[PDB]
Design a protein around this nucleic acid. Structure first.
Ligand SMILES: [Ca+2]
Ligand SMILES: [Ca+2]
Ligand SMILES: [K+]
Ligand SMILES: [K+]
Lengths: 301, 316
DNA sequence: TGATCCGTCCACCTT
DNA sequence: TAGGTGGACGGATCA
């Protein structure tokens, strides 16, 4: 995500009841779930409970898994750290969780690259009605209709949309991509000293990062209060704004991520009680009757 | 002062009405008033003789409530302070790589004497000398905002005296001890975690972590032994609890080194044995000299005598 | 000037 | 994993 971005977008949130999501097709960004569940087979327990919450409220989810890591992201990570192996164990957990999904009759895909980018594309193609994720990157990838904190234990979830963000904060997609280069994200380290308050002020005052850069480099005398304090801060943090600021690579990474444009509509099956019974028995030692108590209310006649 | 110390002592503060201080003898720590008035009072640059205006207004407030002040000025800067501060600056520089005149001092002291108010110059730090005055019962309280006064053994402190309020914040060592479990040695050892004029403290140690260290280990020697013994004999780590395993991880990440200067006897000695005047001769308060105050304010600030009279006559 | 305010930074926690 | 949070940090302001 973009660092501190939810602090900025937070006031535009609209609480909606879980009951209002009935029959909605929802892209579920599941790229990060296995890591969050890292008692044997906690990934299964974790996926099971979240899947049940979605289906309990009649949501029609499509699960999206990460594909590759793009180069800019790999680089930015690398500069921040500056019988089976881990990969094999990961492969197995993903496979098991996907087996669980299919027994629930829930479709899933593996994005070519970032899951959130793919989620945004699913919504653009009207293959889903909304996106369930807590990763603010989704906005920069052109996402809207985002449902955040879906898995907190509250009666409501937070609904965000690109329209409200524009109307209320004056921010469009290019603005958010530029905010990322101040705040930092997976694709850029941002600027030292630039938090959500200073970053928003910069966009509001200078409109864009080019003007921001120009005001800075040219000036290095009749500057107002705001400009004077900001310049000293940039100086004090040894900020250099060269020909790579703003970054065309960052812009392209968010504006043109690798996604699948396939327009085949997703198909939802019904949960397979028999196969879920045996799966849960095998994986976690649940008696069938225990599985039934949770799962039978999910079975239409 | 000791960094964040008022955050720690704050909840023991008791609000006291200025009216209650009538006839109290009060050591006034005036060591940074001049520089403060220089920086706090400007035009559109320092306004002229703001040190006179500033001192005059504060003196009148004290006299208005019948306080019997004795003003204390700094003498020298202790070597340990000069060393601490210069090292602090050197290391901050090594991360990125309006003056007080003798006449200003003489002027405010002339003002003081025309008010008939006794003043002294401490051999070194004013706060240390204030604590000594109280210990010898030459005064009944100390007016200062600088937390160092507790470490120098000051026990009855009046903070925010010149804020625009009906009350002043009273602090005493006995309440700090009783309510926070902190004695003088504890406070001096807190300084070595938090930082003060006499030590740059430890990275990562704010008021929360520093209080925890003193509570859990009792003293810095015990803390050091715990850290160092466990860093060497890793076997001693296996049995330590959550707090200790988390604290250790933090100190390591912060590259903390606790050597033979930790705790520092130089720091302890500087607070326990500051250079102060031990004279037991009581102070004598005079009466304000209206004639000489009139001419002083006239000369220094252009105040017509009638302006001075309007303020000074009720005080006399 | 020392203390306070407030925006930011950092690492742990929860998931 | 990574958003949130608790605690620390630091520059600008208070007074
Ligand atoms: Ca992302
Ligand atoms: Ca001091
Ligand atoms: K930043
Ligand atoms: K510290």
């Amino acid at each position: 995500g973009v660092h501190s971005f939810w602090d900025i977008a937070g006031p535009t949130a609209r609480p909606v009841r879980l009951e209002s999501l009935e029959d909605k097709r929802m892209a579920v960004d599941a790229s990060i779930w296995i890591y969050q569940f890292l008692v044997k087979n906690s990934h299964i327990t974790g996926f099971f409970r979240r899947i049940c919450k979605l289906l309990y409220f009649g949501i029609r989810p499509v699960f999206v898994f990460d594909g590759g890591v793009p180069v800019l992201k790999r680089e930015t990570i690398r500069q921040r750290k500056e019988k089976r192996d881990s990969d094999e164990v990961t492969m197995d957990m993903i496979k098991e969780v996907q087996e669980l999904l299919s027994r629930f009759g829930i479709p899933y895909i593996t994005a070519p690259m970032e899951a959130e980018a793919q989620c945004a594309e699913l919504l653009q193609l009207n293959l889903v009605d909304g996106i369930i994720t807590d990763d603010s990157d989704v906005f920069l990838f052109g996402g809207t209709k985002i449902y955040k904190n879906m898995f907190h234990e509250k009666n409501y979830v937070e609904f965000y949309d690109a329209e409200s963000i524009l109307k209320l904060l004056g921010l469009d997609r290019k603005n958010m991509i530029e905010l990322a280069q101040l705040l930092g994200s997976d694709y850029t380290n941002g600027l030292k000293g630039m938090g959500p308050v200073s970053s928003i002020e910069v966009i509001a005052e200078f409109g864009n990062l080019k003007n921001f850069k120009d005001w800075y480099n040219n000036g290095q005398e009749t500057e107002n209060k705001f400009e004077k304090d900001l310049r000293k801060k940039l100086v004090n943090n040894e900020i250099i704004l060269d020909d790579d600021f703003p970054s065309v690579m960052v812009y392209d990474a968010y504006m043109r991520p690798e996604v699948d444009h396939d327009t085949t509509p997703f198909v939802w099956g019904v949960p397979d009680l028999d196969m879920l019974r045996s799966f849960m028995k095998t994986q976690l030692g649940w008696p069938h009757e225990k599985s039934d108590e949770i799962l039978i209310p999910l079975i239409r006649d």
